[PDB]
Amino acid sequence: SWAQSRDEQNLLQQKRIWESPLLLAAKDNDVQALNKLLKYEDCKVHQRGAMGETALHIAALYDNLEAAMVLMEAAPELVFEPMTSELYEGQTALHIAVVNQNMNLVRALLARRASVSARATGTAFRRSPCNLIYFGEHPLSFAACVNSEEIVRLLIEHGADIRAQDSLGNTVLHILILQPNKTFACQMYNLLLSYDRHGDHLQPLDLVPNHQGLTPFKLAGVEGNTVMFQHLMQKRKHTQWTYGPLTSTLYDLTEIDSSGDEQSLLELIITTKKREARQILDQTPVKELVSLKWKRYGRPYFCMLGAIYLLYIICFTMCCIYRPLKPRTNNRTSPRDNTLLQQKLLQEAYMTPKDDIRLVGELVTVIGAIIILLVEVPPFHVLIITYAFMVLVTMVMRLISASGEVVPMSFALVLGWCNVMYFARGFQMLGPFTIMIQKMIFGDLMRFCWLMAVVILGFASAFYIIFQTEDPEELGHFYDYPMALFSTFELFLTIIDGPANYNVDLPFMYSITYAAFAIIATLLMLNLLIAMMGDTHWRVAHERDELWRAQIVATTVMLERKLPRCLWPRSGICGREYGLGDRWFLRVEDRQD
Template identity: 70%
Template sequence: MQDVTKAPACSPPLQLLLSPRPAPLNHIPVTCQCPKGEDMGPPPPKARGLWIQLQKLLTSWLGGQQDWTQHLDEAYMLQQKRIRESPLLRAAKDNDLCVLKKLLLDRTCDFRQRGALGETALHIAALYDNLEAAMVLTEAAPELVKEPAICEPFVGEEPERFFKVDTGQTALHIAVMNQNVNLVKALLAHGASVSARAVGSAFCLSPHNLLYFGEHPLSFAACVGSEEIVRLLIEHGADIRAQDSLGNTVLHILVLQPNKTFACQMYNLLLSYDGRGDHLQSLDLVPNHQGLTPFKLAGVEGNTTMFQHLMQKRKHIQWMCGPLTSTLYDLTEIDSWGEDVSFLELVVSSKRREARQILEQTPVKQLVSVKWRKYGRPYFCILGALYVLYMICFTMCCIHRPLKSRSGNRTNSRDITILQQKLLQILLSMHLSVYLLPCLLPSCLPYECSICYACTVDKQKKLEEAYVTQQDKIRLVGELMTIFGAVIILFLEIPDIFRVGFSRYFGQTVLGGPFHVITITYASLVLVTMVMRLSNTNGEVVPMSFALVLGWCSVMYFARGFQMLGPFTIMIQKMIFGDLLRFCWLMAVVIVGFASAFFIIFQTEDPSNLGQFYDYPMALFSTFELFLTIIDGPANYDVNLPYMFSIVYFAFAIIATLLMLNLFIAMMGDTHWRVAHEQDELWRAQVVATTVMLERKMPRTLWPRSGICGYKYGLGDRWFLRVETNQDQNALRVRRYVEAFKGSDKEEEHEHLSEKQPSVVESGILARASLALPTPSLSRTTSRSSSSHRGWEIIRRNTLGHLNLGLDLGEGDGEESVYHI
């Protein structure tokens, strides 16, 4: 063995060559030491196991995201420690070619040794952008090119992924992300796999990760914006249609990138390679596992730049006449007619606020306007009118429900009930006993049976008293209409719950989530009332009263058809489910605390003089009324009140009335201010959601497809929407004025320089200065005063001519013709 003192300066001791392979990150030994003198003996096995499980559950519940961050921090610290301990990894990091070559020539050196994250020396050389060290490693050990990192953040948690081919982060992924073209060429020359997938938690789409580049080297290259590497990978056989674990193609991943400009350029580049294969479906129409194409994903994410870029590729300009332009827009994937995954529904149900800006883009804005104006608004108004009539019918049926005078005696002095519900019971056997028994056996009935028969007839008359008069029959028709309407509501709502999903259907405010809950609850209460009426169950007033409140509250849903009232309903929803729920928790704590105190104070007093806090339920209700200032503070000046009542009531008045109520009002004012700034966007989103809902539920014969069929005009089996736009002439005029100023400045500068006759070097310096500093300096202001005056005169004349066309009709034609393009 070579002596360390005789070794060259660039070589480490050879005793460190055979570094032991580190333990996996998930199997780091943890030692626990107990304080001396405090050993109380081991607990029982069952108790110890239960305590360990509770401790793990509590730790996982309290840790959350901090566990993941700490996990990564420890992993990267172990990586650096492992690199310092291993001469091979350290040489690859430092790009020390002398040490690296000697280590690779030594037979005792394991060139497959890995770091703490399962990376090889080639991974480290590519990570630190050391081209020379990577070239030495690929020449000495070409098999390292295909070796992936085998630690959990880079290969996933499933053990079987370790044995899959082309799974895990390779050196090619790292070289592509660092945009090292020479290293990418070297790795591809040594057989690097272009289809390797970098799977694992470090590469998935997660809030923990700062970026998402997919899994394949091609998507990595497209996301970093390296056109040369993209072409290089495609030439070596990279599949542009490859999909990652989420089903996203490289086009989907480009839509999710924050750099919109590079994403659009790469999108065009990749689509230029799409037509070279024999594929029936275009690359930009391939959906991911959620059924979203790149175009729909751009709408969901609110990527207006990518959306406009894709729409520019789909439009066809018919003609241009002055400021007017007629354009045909392809409605593929935009029109919700006949599609299971509607683009418009995805946009309005997106959690991103930027997605609502898509509704302002052409042609989405025009398409929604056509549908709403032509079909949506009339049908929605008709539906609202029918629902109001339906609720009036239900209300009249409830008001005129069958009641009769109370027959029993009242035993409680506090009972003030004077009417009770009429009974309804239809029994086939009772009808048979009434009509068939006397006919079959008229002479064989004994006296007791005759008495029973008479009682049966009398009871039958009482049971049929709910529907006897003409008014009862009219009410019966209204009740049947009410039940029929409730069944229709459930029939329309329940299929949408399974189609959209429970949380999304009831949780989206724009889609009318709370109103869906109210409507379904109302229909269910109507059916419960029907069952209670048929079974002669007392207490139908409970579901009936709740149904009336919920049914009339659902009328507010139809306010979204009006621009003034639509955002108003959203304000109410946000205040109820945001401010009011938070305030109710605080209110409940205050009411329970002070109600208990009031009950204890008056527990020993005579309730006849001051009975608001006699029992605990009454104390809770009275404190609630005091909290909302519905009643004044109870007082009786004829008796002596407990002195603690004044102290407690003073604190209650300060905390509840003065502080908490004003705090609640301020919270609602803040919510109103926030919603008021978004009311136009919110109302437009409500209109889109309502239009899509009506289009999905209405028959196709009552809702034809909007747009122009391209098949009739030789444009294929697609639908188009023609949009006429008026270009802003002011922008063109400003551009002409700027060009006029630039031209006059160049003329003055040329005359000024020709008078002084500068040298070639000076003219070059002035030219470079004029390019570097386009803003005019103060020293040149005097020399350009005449040209600037002429330019401002042109602006004045054109502005006045824009306001009054008769001002410039007789003058300035020759001069103006110079500046008009």
């Protein structure tokens, strides 16, 4: 109940102006009421609303230019009056008359010398999901957003700095990018670059970052405004000769490419949670870049590392299928027909020099897992890191030489095999299946296991209690409750044969209850989940190529953060050899229509 208090600071506003006949006279443009109310009797000009309202802010608010013209003579200084607090801080009526598309009161307030650099630093202006909008601080940004061109030009004519920033360090161009209207603000980007005229030696205003280092180009890459991004790419390209339908162009590639820890554009496209920024991957300077960076120097390094990983796993399992494992020379099977096991896993028998090869490849696994961890001292990181935890757990478990060492070999074995599926993404037409695993587990099954838990607890708890009476020597599916859940689980997935003896009678309730489980769960809840996975598969299969491209990009970015130079040059042509400067361009050709 947070913004309710906001409304409590709003409706009080709707009370106060309602009970102030000055400001109720500022509601409606009753000039005669302003003359008798204002020019005749003495009235203070300092009547403050719920959060800083003046009657000049009210007539400014409710479209009353004629009332504000009466308010000029009674208030030369409420032109300079901001709003007090907690929603609107530093906002004056200049911002207000700017906002409502015009008033021509901009002529009146700049005629009374309004502060063009007034920062509306209130709560409701700041970037928030609770706020429905984000216009910045300065009214130049406000008129910039609402597409009031001659008003903006009039604001440059009154010396408003285009280079002014907000609390977030954003320039007015950064504010233009954050607007959801895209081509409706692109012409403002065309206009304000003409007002770069006094070229600052720091930047010509197009390379100015925010507090988090976002140049507006890279901001447009982060925000995924493709319409904006293409138009800024019109600036970046430098076309060469055209040959009929052929056209040689030369993209700039400075902020796009990785540089000397520039934290490149592509990195911020991957690391953002914004889904639609990956449409920037569909751009032809982008897609060609990652295409070239994959088809050479990315793909053979990836497949070579994956082959080395294959030799690591085969090197692992081979020294893992051979284990010391004496005969059970120790104690006899004390529970009858229960402890069927005979191996007990030898203590320090490091003899039999076949086991020396086991020792060598075992040390290969230990050292390789140490290499994995030294990579990872700073969704598939967790498989390899926790896998390496399991390798060290079974390693120390062998050095202490304790008993229960089958479980870390088990965990590390299923993780060690399944972790090679990360390498399937560099093998196009097998790439997006890992994403299909991701959505079928985390997107569907994790929000469906909470439903199946009901049923498995139901019939597990049923069949245990029904078979509390029975001899577990016949149909030992449910002799114990924690394994009754297990048998019930396997019956749910249609794995077990289905318990039936035919030699003795069943309990009579079991025939009903097993039919009930047979209907509601075997065909019914199961095939629904199958249909969910089927919708998932077609849904991913629709856009699997772009998703594969995202796999390639994330693979490349992850590769560059873990690989030095001298074998990875930065791609694209170099400058400086052809008079092109330090910028590393790239050329590409395209036949037309």
